[PDB]
């Protein structure tokens, strides 16, 4: 399944500036906590693959920037 990282903070996407790979949301999305292996950035967000249902990604169940 693949989603778009968004800030825990108030839940508005995810936004990036260096396009093509990158270290941080190649990190994030590796971490144990997603079980995501690719990622990189979509324009200017964070496109992820390789994770459930049950980690919270956009949109917000509960949020709605």
């Given at each position: 399944k693949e989603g778009y990282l968004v800030k825990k903070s108030d839940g508005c996407k995810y936004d990036c500036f260096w396009?093509?790979?990158?270290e941080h949301c190649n990190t994030e999305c590796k971490?144990?906590?997603?079980?995501?292996s690719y990622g990189y950035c979509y324009a200017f967000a964070c496109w992820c693959e390789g994770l459930p249902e049950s980690t919270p990604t956009y949109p917000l169940p509960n949020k709605s920037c």
């Open positions: 396009l093509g790979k990158n971490a144990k906590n997603q079980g995501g």
